[PDB]
Each structure stands twice: as C-alpha cells, then as structure tokens.
Amino acid sequence: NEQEKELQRRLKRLYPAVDEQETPLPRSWSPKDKFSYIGLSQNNLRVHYKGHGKTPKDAASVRATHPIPAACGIYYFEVKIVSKGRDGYMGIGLSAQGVNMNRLPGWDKHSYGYHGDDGHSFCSSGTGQPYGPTFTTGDVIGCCVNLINNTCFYTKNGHSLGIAFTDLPPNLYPTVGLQTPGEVVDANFGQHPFVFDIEDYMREWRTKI
C-alpha cells in the first residue's frame, strides 16, 4: 500500500529510536478498546458517535491500539473535527489502560482531555480549567506528549496552546471522546503530514536542553 508506506516513513522519521517490534506504535483506534456508542470507519481512523444522544451519560471514548512508548521522547498525534454534530461535546487527550470509556477523556483518574465546547482542560476531574479556545467543525487539534518530562501541550490549526498537563503517568493511550449524535473526528497518527510543524518543535526542544 501507498498509505502504509508513508505511515512507516513518517513514524521512522519522527521516532527514530522506537523499535516497533519491542513497542508497537499506535496507528489506529482500537475496535476492542472503545465504548459501545463509538463507531469506527476508514481503516479505524474515523470516529463517530452512534448512541442515541438522550441518556444520563451519553459520553463515549475510544483508545488507540497501543500506549505511547517512552522511546518516542516526544510524541504527537492530530485529530481533525470533521463534524461537531449536535453539541460538539468532544474531548481529545490521553488515558491509561482500563479507564472507564463511558466518559469524556479527563473526567476520570489517569485521564486527560481538552474539550471543544468550552476550551477547557480536564485533568482527572469532572471540572475543567480554562485552557484554550473552543474548537469545532474544520479545526485540527494536536496533542504533543513529552515522555522525558511528562508534560503535554495541545495545538490548534498549527499553533501551540501551551502546556496543559504535567505529572503525566507512563503508558498513556491517545484517546478521543464524543457525546452527541453527528460528532465525527479523524485521527492522524502519522498517516499524513501534520498541520503543526512537529519536526521543527522537536528540533527546537532538543537544542533547548
């Protein structure tokens, strides 16, 4: 395949120290590690809400196939908001293995999220902090994780939004959560060029230390 050729080259280029035989990289969303209200399509890169959006907890999350290996040093993925759907209650972030998936990322312990309706970051609590702008249909949201200093920043349409989280646990999974019908988002785990210039960021950071 040509899609997979470009993916392999980009992973090799961004994460030269990672041997995927030892630590496979996340390349798509997991069909097994998701809540029932999540549907996957487009080689498991596209996420859509498929629950009836009228229950006490409609929130539904999905984790990528693998956790981020430390040997990345710095890890990056981007999520494109194809459709904000009804209310655009969409969260992008990270979560540990086994975290409850009837939630948006960040509501629970060992779960971290940036939510589009309010621009708020969620760090193991149901109450957010003001962090960034809202985001909606058309926007690209990136999540950059530093495995060395255990911090994370997000990006919007190519622009850093500053550090959102510190004291991140290891072995976090890229995670997306949706809540209302019509919400659709796409992961780029490296299948495509990133909107954010992650290579330049990685260069600047390795010089800074």
Binding site: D87, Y89, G116, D118, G126, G128
Partner: peptide, 6 residues
Amino acid sequence: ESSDSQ
C-alpha cells in the same frame, strides 16, 4: 456538557 455533570 464537557463537564462530567449538568
């Protein structure tokens, strides 16, 4: 909402 609880 994005809050765990209305």
